[PDB]
RNA sequence: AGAAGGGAGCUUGACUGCGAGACCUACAAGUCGAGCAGGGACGAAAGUCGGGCUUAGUGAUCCGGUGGUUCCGCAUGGAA
RNA sequence: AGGUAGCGAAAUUCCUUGUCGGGUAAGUUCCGACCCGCACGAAAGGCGUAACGAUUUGGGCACUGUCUCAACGAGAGACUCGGUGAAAUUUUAGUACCUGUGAAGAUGCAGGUUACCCGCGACAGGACGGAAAGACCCCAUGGAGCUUUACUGUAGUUUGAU
RNA sequence: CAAGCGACUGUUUAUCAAAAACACAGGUCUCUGCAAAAUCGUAAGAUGAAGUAUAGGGGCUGACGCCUGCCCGGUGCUGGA
RNA sequence: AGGUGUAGUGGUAGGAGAGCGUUCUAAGGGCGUUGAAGGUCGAUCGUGAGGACGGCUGGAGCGCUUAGAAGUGAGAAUGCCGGUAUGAGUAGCGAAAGACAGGUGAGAAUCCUGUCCACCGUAUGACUAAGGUUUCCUGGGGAAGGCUCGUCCGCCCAGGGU
RNA sequence: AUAUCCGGGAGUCAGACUGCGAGUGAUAAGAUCCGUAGUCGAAAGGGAAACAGCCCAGACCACCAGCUAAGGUCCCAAAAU
RNA sequence: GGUAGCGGAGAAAUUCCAAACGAACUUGGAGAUAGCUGGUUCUCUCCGAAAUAGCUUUAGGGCUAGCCUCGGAAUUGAGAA
RNA sequence: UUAAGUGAAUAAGGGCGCACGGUGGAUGCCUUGGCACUAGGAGCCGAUGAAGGACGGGACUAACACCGAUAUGCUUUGGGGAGCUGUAAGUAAGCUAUGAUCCAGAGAUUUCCGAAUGGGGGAACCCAAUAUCUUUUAUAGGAUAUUACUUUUCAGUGAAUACAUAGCUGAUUAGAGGUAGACGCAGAGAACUGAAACAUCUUAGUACCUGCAGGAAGAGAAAGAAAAUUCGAUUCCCUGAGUAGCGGCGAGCGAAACGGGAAGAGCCCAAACCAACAAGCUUGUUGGGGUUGUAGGACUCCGAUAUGGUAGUCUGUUAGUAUAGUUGAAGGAUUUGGAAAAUUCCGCUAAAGAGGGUGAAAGCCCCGUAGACGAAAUGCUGACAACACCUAGGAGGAUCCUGAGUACGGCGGAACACGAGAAAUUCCGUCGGAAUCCGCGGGGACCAUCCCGCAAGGCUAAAUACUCCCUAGUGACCGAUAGUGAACCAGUACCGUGAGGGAAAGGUGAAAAGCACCCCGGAAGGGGAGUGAAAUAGAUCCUGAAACCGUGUGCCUACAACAAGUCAAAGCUCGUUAAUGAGUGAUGGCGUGCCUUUUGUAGAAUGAACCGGCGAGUUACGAUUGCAUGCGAGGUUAAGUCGAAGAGACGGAGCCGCAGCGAAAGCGAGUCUGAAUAGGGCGAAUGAGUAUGUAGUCGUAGACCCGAAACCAUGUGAUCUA
């Protein structure tokens, strides 16, 4: 309440709306996944039960913020291009689940 | 838990109430005049021991005056012809000299004396 | 509060007029028999500290109680029938005269029972062992089942 | 008046995306802006042009209208 | 549609004690009259009116302590004594005057002046005395009652469809 | 003796106003054909009336005497449609 | 742990910091009929809130240390309740006639008796409805009530009465 | 020897007088309204007889010690008749 | 005996309805709300304002800023004279 | 001698200090009673007369408690073992080992009023009818029973009116009122308030009123939730989440599903069809049959009369359990004292060292406690038995059935978090109004497709809410101005016409041993003498503060203008927590209270008569910051389960953090804008979080305390007055 000047928030337009569809992913980046050996199979139930990824929510994204150092077969909802070429580049693979 | 009033309010009132004994009728008995007038006590305790030193001051220095003039001197002329000498003694110990050793009281003055007219 | 005292719905008297205090209620707060303003209600105390907080305060009771040779442990605690003075006699035994935390084994009906009318004993279970049980006292005897038990539980 | 005044030709920069940095300022706002890109006007070129000598000519949000839209579309395709 | 009859300085006339006449030694009131009716007027009636009125208003006779102007007497209280015994108020008070000062009006501050201690009967100038959290005045995006061609509703009434 | 106001007897602000205020008989307007209009009530049921237009309700005026002029554009009411 | 040096140390609203005291809880360690708490007095200690120690009173409980929790601190609210002042031995003691003798009694202007006097008498008499609800009668009483007094009472006690 | 910046907690939104510079006012007001400095507010002490706002000056305390400020030195009343 | 508070009754005065009636009394919603007035209880230490701007159905209220306080970060030291 | 000068003492009264009293009832200690809860019990009582009352009952009886004309008690069954006739003494008269009083179970009695109910009525009163009995010669008198109203069923009478029906009489049957000031469902439904005004909105579907309940209620067995592909009645808890949404898009309002838990349970009808009966080929009654969505059933075929289940019954039997009880270890001295439990000395008991009492503080004195044990009677619970009641498989579709004035629609309202909105879903009023298995409904306007279901019929335990009462306990809850209004004869006294408002008031002592007797006095009251450890513990009784009132007197005071103190100071009087002491104080200097509120108050502004007690920033849930601890790219559990109303363990659902950018699709250490590899915004680069404690502040709550005028909703009043 400002005293009767109109408040900051009357003065403001409301933007924008929320997609009932909205699907927002678990991020996981690289770093984190040089926590696995060399081979591991990197699985949605593997980051759970590792306590990485406590809540998935539409699904496990992969972000390539890090370095990846481990070769790894990762499987997650989606993966970033950059993320992708990292695995790869590691010599690991990426599969779409 | 429940704390009660107890004895404390009591006891702080009646210290209060020991430092009005003397004073006028209600004064050292109701705690709300007794405190009333401790407070103003203090102010005029406080204030008073500053006055006190005021007080002595202009005694010594009226006394001295008598003094000085009975040797043919005034009081001004007096404390700035011991100046002169370097004469250090204060007005309290010229005002005992003054009344309880007029001999030695005489000496200051003539060195007093001495000291203008050089 | 003034609202759960007896009556006082009424206005004493009338605002203007009369010469008194404007009153609004004889249940009042600054009324003698009135509602007490704020006070006491009932509520809980109890809060819980983090699991792992729990279990280093466990430990460090007892790991006190070892570095401090306060430990004193009995490799079993045996009475045919429940006797006071019996186990009054293996505290003698074990030099025990101070404040002492007597833990047994689960099933010890006859040493629980023998030992818990001493006024400086206090008995617990291994699997009933609480942080406060065991700062209360000044020794700690355990049977060496009941130890193995603890051991189990931590 | 090295015009910001006056006349004439061609024009539409009274451009789009913006914008380092400043001024002003409780906030919300208000003011100036080199420069970058797109596509231009005038000019031989330099260059000037994001209205007018400068500073007034204005009104938050909510709610509605109209136009556009690679946005969303409550099982799905649509629609609303 | 422009106020007629009647009345009119009026329970209405501001100017206003209008003006003139009467009444008085002297009449801002009263009565009679005049009419520039600030701003009378015909059923929120006009004008008049015998009788009536604890009605308002002016004059007169009688009468008087109303007054000139106050005096005396009776009783009750007051006063003294015996009995009985409240109250409002109250920061503590050993509680003067003048002039000054100061939140601009001081028993209390300054300067000066006056004043032995304690009461009793009296009086009210002050204690901005007591009584009541000013009623006037303003304010509060207080309250209540009232009004309407304020807003929004609504009982009722009415009209149509079913 | 005289003037204002109210015709009159009455009535009223229990507790600051008894009056020139209210009432009044009289006047006038208007509504009401009876399950009247009007009022109390969601209704049933009542009052009006066990009355019936010379009666009942409402507005205004206010004994009596002499009188009560002009305006229907406006607003209401009534009728028209 | 302290020492030196320089500087600083008025303060409302208000911010920060550090403490005093109250009741209760826990643990430890203690004190109490050889006298706890509380009260009261004293010329006591600390920079402050405050803390001891004695005497007296008192007659059962209560400190201390560390930590915890708080209905935790009053001088003001025309605060609430209680007590007691001030005004005061003051206002008032509620429309009127009583006097004296004798009696009763610890005590009588005030109770009883007598005498005269005085007051009401379309009443201050005689009935009765309501209302009250034992106030009626008799014998005792004098704390309170009675505006004084009281031996008396519409009061109190004990009996009775329709 | 402070400045910014980030964050926790405020209080304040009646000001007053004095000097100086202006307006309003009658170049009246202990008036009103700004600017500017100070004091009061929230500041005791000394001086101005008394006297929030003027002059001197900022009280952590003790002293029966000394020096000064404004202002003073014939008596009240300290100090040069 | 009848009429009861969104009411009754009123020869009408805001008149009466159990000693205050522009709308009774009682209990409840209820600790109504109160930008208003009053009150708000131990101590010492450190620091210490404001009475201004802007906006406000705003003017004795509030909000952001200014001014106070506490903590923190950091720089070629950015403050003051 | 004279003159001039100086000049004490004195107090009518007053002041200060001190001592001792009175008044008063603070303080301390204590407690009869309260407050908040936990575990279990019980969750209703009434026409077989309730709740609540009135009036009565005792050897004397005013009150309370108990009881009811069988009255301070009766019978009976158990328990208990020496006293008893309540509070309450006193006298009196009695009872009890042939078992009293007392305790528990079961019965008897139970006046009058009150729903009240034969009629009436101003409750606790009055007045009847009929039958039987009784009193009197008889009338009068007395006793017992029956007699309200409506409802259900049956019978009988019986109108207008023919048969009938209505009415009427009787019988039968069942309600009628009260509560527990709580909890549930439903009808009806405010206002102050918030929105800084206010009509939408909010307060709220709250308060109030009314109906119906039940021990719980309500809901409940999909015309569901969904779209991870699936789940499989309902209820409640955690979470989702202050999210999605709603909203003068303001103030505010605010879900649900999924996930995790507590608890779990399912079943009956209508219709088709079959059979029987009755009636006017159907058209009713009864019984069978049947019960649903991977559609079921009828029907037609075959085939088994089994096997399982239960939310049945005063069916017994049995066990347990509630309602009385029994038993239950161990100390003596010594010192102090009135008294020992304190103390000292040696002992002992403990499945008991919980607690209370006892002449102070007791493991061993008493009551108890741990433990063991006990039931004639009546409940309650669990089993077991009995009995009752439910419970068929498979294959066929030709036909038949599967809830109509219903679904749904228009209009007007309401409920859904959802305010008509794009408004689905549910409901109410009004009008219109379907299909029916090749059908119907839902998946948030609507259509198609797909998926999920099968309305218009009913019932149903548990997990949930609450506590007037009962039993056993608990408390960093109260300790008489508190705690209930009420510790005490309190909903009393008292106030009010009434509704209604509503107090004050605890403490002798270990024991009354409550002061024989004497003395003054009419008494009251004192003084002795006694009792007692103490009476200055004497009943107004523990302690006994202050205001206030008084007595004694060390110092001062009758020339002085004084917020009354302070600083300086003679004199006098005293001697300490022994301190460069105490009281008083002539005289001198200085000096306008406290608080609030103000630019500024000694203020002739406010507040306080005084003293004492009480009297105002709290708690819960959230937000956020500081401090602290644990763990750390991680941190942490919630409900719940076990457990002492504890710690703890389990529980990972969920929440925060680890990634941002964008309205969004979406991309991602980037991203959005843009044509842009540009520029710019926000981010990363350039990492610290999270749980809990603690403090500061804020938000929602009365939110620091007191105070309006008023508003609204039930009631109470015309004994005043119109
Ligand atoms: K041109
Ligand atoms: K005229
Ligand atoms: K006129
Ligand atoms: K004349
Ligand atoms: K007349
Ligand atoms: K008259
Ligand atoms: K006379
Ligand atoms: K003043
Ligand atoms: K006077
Ligand atoms: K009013
Ligand atoms: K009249
Ligand atoms: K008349
Ligand atoms: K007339
Ligand atoms: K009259
Ligand atoms: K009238
Ligand atoms: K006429
Ligand atoms: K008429
Ligand atoms: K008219
Ligand atoms: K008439
Ligand atoms: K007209
Ligand atoms: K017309
Ligand atoms: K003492
Ligand atoms: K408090
Ligand atoms: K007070
Ligand atoms: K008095
Ligand atoms: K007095
Ligand atoms: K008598
Ligand atoms: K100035
Ligand atoms: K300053
Ligand atoms: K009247
Ligand atoms: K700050
Ligand atoms: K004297
Ligand atoms: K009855
Ligand atoms: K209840
Ligand atoms: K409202
Ligand atoms: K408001
Ligand atoms: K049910
Ligand atoms: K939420
Ligand atoms: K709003
Ligand atoms: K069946
Ligand atoms: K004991
Ligand atoms: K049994
Ligand atoms: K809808
Ligand atoms: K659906
Ligand atoms: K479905
Ligand atoms: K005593
Ligand atoms: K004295
Ligand atoms: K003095
Ligand atoms: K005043
Ligand atoms: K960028
Ligand atoms: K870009
Ligand atoms: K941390
Ligand atoms: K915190
Ligand atoms: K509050
Ligand atoms: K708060
Ligand atoms: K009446
Ligand atoms: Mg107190
Ligand atoms: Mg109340
Ligand atoms: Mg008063
Ligand atoms: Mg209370
Ligand atoms: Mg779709
Ligand atoms: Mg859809
Ligand atoms: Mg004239
Ligand atoms: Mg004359
Ligand atoms: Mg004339
Ligand atoms: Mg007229
Ligand atoms: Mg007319
Ligand atoms: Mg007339
Ligand atoms: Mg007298
Ligand atoms: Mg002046
Ligand atoms: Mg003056
Ligand atoms: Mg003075
Ligand atoms: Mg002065
Ligand atoms: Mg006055
Ligand atoms: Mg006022
Ligand atoms: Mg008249
Ligand atoms: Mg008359
Ligand atoms: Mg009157
Ligand atoms: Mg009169
Ligand atoms: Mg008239
Ligand atoms: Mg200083
Ligand atoms: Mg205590
Ligand atoms: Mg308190
Ligand atoms: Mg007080
Ligand atoms: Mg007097
Ligand atoms: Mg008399
Ligand atoms: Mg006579
Ligand atoms: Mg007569
Ligand atoms: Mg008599
Ligand atoms: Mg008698
Ligand atoms: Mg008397
Ligand atoms: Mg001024
Ligand atoms: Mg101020
Ligand atoms: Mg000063
Ligand atoms: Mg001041
Ligand atoms: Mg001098
Ligand atoms: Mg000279
Ligand atoms: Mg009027
Ligand atoms: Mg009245
Ligand atoms: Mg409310
Ligand atoms: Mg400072
Ligand atoms: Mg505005
Ligand atoms: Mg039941
Ligand atoms: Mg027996
Ligand atoms: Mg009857
Ligand atoms: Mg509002
Ligand atoms: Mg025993
Ligand atoms: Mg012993
Ligand atoms: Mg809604
Ligand atoms: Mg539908
Ligand atoms: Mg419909
Ligand atoms: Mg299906
Ligand atoms: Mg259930
Ligand atoms: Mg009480
Ligand atoms: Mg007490
Ligand atoms: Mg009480
Ligand atoms: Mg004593
Ligand atoms: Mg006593
Ligand atoms: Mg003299
Ligand atoms: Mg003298
Ligand atoms: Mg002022
Ligand atoms: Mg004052
Ligand atoms: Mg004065
Ligand atoms: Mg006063
Ligand atoms: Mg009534
Ligand atoms: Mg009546």
């Known amino acids: 309440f400002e005293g009767g000047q109109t408040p900051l928030f009357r003065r403001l337009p409301k933007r924008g709306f929320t997609n009932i569809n909205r699907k927002d992913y678990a991020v996981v980046n690289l770093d984190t996944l040089n926590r696995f050996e060399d081979g591991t199979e990197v699985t949605p139930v593997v980051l759970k039960e590792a306590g990485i990824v406590k809540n998935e929510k539409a699904g496990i994204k992969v972000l390539a913020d890090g370095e990846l150092t481990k070769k790894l077969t990762v499987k997650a909802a989606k993966f970033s291009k950059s993320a992708q070429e990292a695995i790869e580049a590691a010599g690991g693979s990426i599969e779409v689940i | 838990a429940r704390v009660k009033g107890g004895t404390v309010t009591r006891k702080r009132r009646k210290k209060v109430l020991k430092l009005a004994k003397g004073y006028y009728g209600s004064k050292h008995t109701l705690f709300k005049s007794a405190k009333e007038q401790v407070m103003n006590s203090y102010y005029y305790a406080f204030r008073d021991r500053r006055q006190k030193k005021r007080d002595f001051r202009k005694l010594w220095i009226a006394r001295i005056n008598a003094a000085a003039r009975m040797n043919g001197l005034s009081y001004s002329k007096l404390m700035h012809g011991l100046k002169l000498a370097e004469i250090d003694i204060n007005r309290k110990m010229l005002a005992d000299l003054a009344v309880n050793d007029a001999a030695a009281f005489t000496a200051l003055a003539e060195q007093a004396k001495d000291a203008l007219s050089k | ?154």
């Open chain 3, 1 to 154: 509060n003034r609202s759960a005292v007896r009556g006082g719905g009424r206005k004493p008297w009338r605002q203007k007029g009369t010469g008194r205090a404007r009153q609004g209620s004889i249940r009042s707060p600054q009324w003698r028999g009135g509602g007490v303003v704020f006070g006491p209600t009932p509520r809980s105390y109890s809060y819980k500290f983090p699991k792992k907080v729990r279990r280093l305060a466990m430990k460090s009771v007892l790991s006190d109680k070892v570095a401090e040779n306060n430990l004193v442990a009995v490799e079993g605690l045996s009475f045919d029938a429940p006797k006071t003075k019996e186990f009054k006699q293996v505290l003698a035994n074990l030099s025990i005269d101070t404040k002492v935390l007597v833990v047994l084994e689960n099933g010890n009906d006859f040493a629980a029972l023998s030992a818990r009318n001493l006024p400086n004993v206090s008995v617990v279970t291994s699997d009933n062992v609480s942080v406060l049980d065991v700062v209360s006292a000044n020794k700690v005897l355990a049977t060496q089942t009941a130890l193995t038990q603890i051991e189990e539980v931590l």
